[PDB]
Every structure is written in structure tokens, then in C-alpha cells.
Ligand binder design. Structure first.
Ligand SMILES: C[C@H]1CCCC[C@@H]1Oc1cccc(-c2cc3cc(C(=N)N)c(F)cc3[nH]2)c1O
Lengths: 10, 246
């Protein structure tokens, strides 16, 4: 969606 | 990376791969970097110092392999290449080894967020993890100091931050390591960063966020006993970063 620094998504 | 595991960019979605074009047709890897905001990547000045011609570098985001493509990757041109004024290298250390690259795609846009492209957080002013913290480094650098090629698959590994007192011991790096640097090593001197990982990130969790604590800068050999890897201390360069990323 939008940038959220430090968040990975698996 | 010496040791470590092979990974995919979904595990380091802020990692940027920088390459250089040559008149002749080849494109060779130069160094890694990290995405701080949609249009800026931070790396190390020593990676560009000898060839500061921005039109010749390409930056790719969302890349899991070095010379083959990954689906979802983005390619950028370097709109601005800001090297540090006061950058100095001596017989080992590189001082003020940080650089910024403003990226632009051929259509004129900056990065877009995906499951493979995310930004990493900046620490707060002079705020660092305590020594002992385990941080991870990632990159396409050498797997053995004697190799002359870089791996095709992205690697990662975990190292621990060590104190300045330990790093500045005479039989480590003495005074070559300053306050604007951080040292990180593996307790058993088994895994580490090496040539090619240069410019890439040292990520630790700070106050609940994954923060860019260091930038791979220098080290004697790779995975050598009592020879940690030295990283630029990002928390101490925040004013400089701000100055250009406003
Ligand atoms: C990656 C190259 C291509 C661009 C211009 C030189 C750049 O510089 C380098 C050239 C030769 C060696 C390195 C290098 C080794 C090396 C080793 C370590 C370590 N943890 N032991 C490190 F942290 C950074 C390092 N960087 C390095 O960063």
C-alpha cells in the first residue's frame, strides 16, 4: 500500500 | 557475505543494488545501498569516489539475484549523487563514508512500495543499540576473500555490535576506528561482510523499529579473527542526511 519503514511483509 | 544464508529481497525490501555501465555492453555490480524514502538511497562514498559520473550508474530495487531479473524490480537512474565533503580514506579506514543517490525512473517517478520494495528507518540523533545487540547485514558481496566473482543470490547473516573499547584495542584496529564508526563481528569470526557488501545496510531493531544503524564501510580481510567489520555510524550523520533530504 504505502511505505512503512522497517516493515517486511511475508 | 562469508557464511550466512541465501535469501530473497522480501526479507530485505529496502536493499538497493547499484551497478555501473561500461562502454562495451557490460554492467558490473558496484555496491549495495538502502532506500530511506521514495527518492533517496544511502550507500558509501568510497563506492563512487573513483568514478563519480552519475550517468553511468543504474540502481535496481526489488532485486533478489545479481545478473538475472526478479519480478517486481524497479530500475532507476541516478538524478543526484551526493558524496560526503570530508570523506577520507587512509591505510584502512574510510572516514565520513556515506553517500546519497537521488533516483528517478525512465518515466520520472521514484520508488513505489510493494512486497519487495520498502524503506528502512533512520535512527534518532546519536541514538544507537547497545553493544551485544545482534543486527543483520545483507548483500551480494564475496563469499570467500579469494573469490574474484560475486554470488548471484542475495545473502544475509547476523553479526553483533561490539563496543569501541573492544574495537580500538591495539590488536584490533586501534585508533583507526572513531566515534563516527561502529564495529560489528561474529563471536566466532565465522560470518561477516566482505568486498561487494560495501554501502549496504547493518539493520538492528531500535525502539521497536528496524533501523539502519550502519553502512558497510571497511575491515581487514573478511571474517578474520579480531578484525571486525567497521560501519559508518548513521545516527551521527543525521544532520548531513537532512541537509540533502529535506
Ligand atoms: C565494493 C568496491 C567497489 C566500488 C569501489 C571500491 C568498493 O570498495 C572495496 C574494495 C575492496 C574491498 C572492500 C571491502 C572489504 C571489506 C571488508 C569488510 C569486513 N567486514 N571485513 C567490510 F565491512 C567492508 C569491506 N569493504 C571494498 O568496500
Amino acid at each position: 500500500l504505502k511505505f512503512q519503514c522497517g516493515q517486511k511483509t511475508l | 557475505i562469508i557464511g550466512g544464508e541465501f535469501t530473497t529481497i522480501e526479507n530485505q525490501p529496502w536493499f538497493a543494488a547499484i551497478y555501473r555501465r561500461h562502454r562495451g555492453g557490460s554492467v558490473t555490480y558496484v555496491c549495495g545501498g538502502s532506500l530511506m524514502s521514495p527518492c533517496w538511497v544511502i550507500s558509501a562514498t568510497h563506492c563512487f569516489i573513483d568514478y563519480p559520473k552519475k550517468e553511468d550508474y543504474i540502481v535496481y530495487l526489488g532485486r533478489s539475484r545479481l545478473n538475472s531479473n526478479t519480478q517486481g524490480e524497479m530500475k532507476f537512474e541516478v538524478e543526484n549523487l551526493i558524496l560526503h565533503k570530508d570523506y577520507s580514506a587512509d591505510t584502512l579506514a574510510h572516514h565520513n563514508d556515506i553517500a546519497l543517490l537521488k533516483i528517478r525512473s525512465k518515466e520520472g517517478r521514484c520508488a513505489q512500495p510493494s512486497r519487495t520494495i520498502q524503506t528502512i528507518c533512520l535512527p534518532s540523533m546519536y541514538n544507537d543499540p547497545q553493544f551485544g545487540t545482534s543486527c543483520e547485514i545483507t548483500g551480494f558481496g564475496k563469499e570467500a576473500s579469494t573469490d574474484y566473482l560475486y554470488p548471484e543470490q542475495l545473502k544475509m547473516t547476523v553479526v553483533k555490535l561490539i563496543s569501541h573499547r573492544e574495537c580500538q584495542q591495539p590488536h584490533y584496529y586501534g585508533s583507526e576506528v572513531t566515534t563516527k564508526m561502529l564495529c560489528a563481528a561474529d563471536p566466532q569470526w565465522k560470518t561477516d561482510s566482505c568486498q561487494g557488501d560495501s554501502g549496504g545496510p547493518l539493520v538492528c531493531s531500535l525502539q521497536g523499529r528496524m533501523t539502519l544503524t550502519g553502512i558497510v564501510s571497511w575491515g581487514r580481510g573478511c571474517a578474520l579473527k579480531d578484525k571486525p567489520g567497521v560501519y559508518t555510524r548513521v545516527s551521527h550523520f543525521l544532520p548531513w542526511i537532512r541537509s540533502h533530504t529535506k
